[PDB]
Design a protein around this ligand. Structure first.
Ligand code: 9TZ
Ligand code: 9TZ
Lengths: 195, 195
């Protein structure tokens, strides 16, 4: 609420980091390397962003990424489609969303219906090379399914602010070259902190 | 032109990386650490972005960063103030720009007038803790001045895609904890490459 914008901002940063591998490029440069072919990236403009969860945060993400020319679709069980259309988000059933997306970001509570919202079954319906962001709650993206999708290249990259366990005790996800991460910084700004 | 949007998108990513230290946070996570106090960040919304150079790329950057609620000011010796106002950028003389900016981004050619555009003189007029982005041409930002401003905290962070010498032979800048960098990736997307 108070911290809606901090969260939305971090999310949009993670989307741009996934498109251009800025974290990985900075580590490469700090190691004295100059690796230009390795960090060939993609443009956001024209790409499709799926926003799962269309409350305050998800709406803030949408309007920000619309300015980059991304197409914004999404799903929220409770938000009427008229409301989501007011902020430029086409609502579709989940089953319609998966194959359309270049990027998927989650802005849901952690409930049994959203634990593993992204899992092996939903990864398999995604377009090959989908990129995912979770700056919401640890466990929305099933971490084992995610590593499997990174290993096969079904998922081309992920950005995680949150983990099923914090700090994350299992490191294969975090240490993967196509994964960028933060220690649950979503609400960690001076402005969110100080009202 | 062809690569205007690739450049503009990398620039907006660098600004978001500066605000939230995403590259530094990922490195901290990849080193097995969980450092939440260290990576306190700031919100973009309400902050001022100075844009030096108001051609295609600078204009693209402006409209994208306007969606985050940043105030966009800037300077371009050619563009009239009524025109730049038409894409939401308030023109002011440089001397006016320096004290007002939370972030400064450069989108100029490399000419005698722009080499060391940011230097010890211009850093001293900036607000304490300014963050700077160069994704245009190496040398617009004087590198020795930049390191001095990072060491003193006059500059709170910088993001560099380009260097006076490439690859950069001198590492005190690149290795600084508040500096994020890439190996001149500005035009490096599949879409810019392939017309
Ligand atoms: C409950 C729920 C299920 C599926 C989904 F995609 C989103 C939500 C939400 O809580 O916003
Ligand atoms: C020539 C020039 C000088 C100062 C500056 F801020 C911008 C430019 C530009 O070429 O856009």
């Amino acid at each position: 609420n108070g911290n809606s914008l901090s969260a939305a901002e971090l999310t949009c940063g993670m989307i741009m980091c996934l498109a251009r591998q800025i974290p990985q490029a900075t580590a490469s440069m700090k190691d004295g390397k100059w690796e230009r072919k390795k960090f060939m990236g993609t443009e956001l403009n024209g790409k499709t962003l799926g926003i799962l969860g269309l409350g305050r945060i998800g709406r803030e993400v949408a309007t920000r990424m619309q300015s980059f020319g991304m197409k914004t679709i999404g799903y929220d069980p409770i938000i009427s489609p008229e409301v989501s259309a007011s902020f430029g988000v086409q609502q579709l059933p989940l089953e319609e969303i998966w194959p359309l997306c270049d990027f998927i970001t989650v802005h849901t509570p952690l409930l049994p219906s959203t634990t593993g919202l992204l899992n092996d079954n939903t990864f398999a319906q995604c377009k090959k090379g989908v990129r995912v962001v979770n700056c919401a709650r640890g466990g929305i993206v099933d971490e084992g399914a995610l590593l499997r999708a990174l290993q096969s290249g079904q998922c081309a990259g992920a950005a995680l602010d949150v983990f099923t366990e914090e700090p994350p005790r299992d490191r294969a996800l975090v240490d993967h070259e196509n994964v960028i991460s933060c220690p649950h910084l979503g609400a960690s700004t001076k402005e969110a902190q100080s009202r």
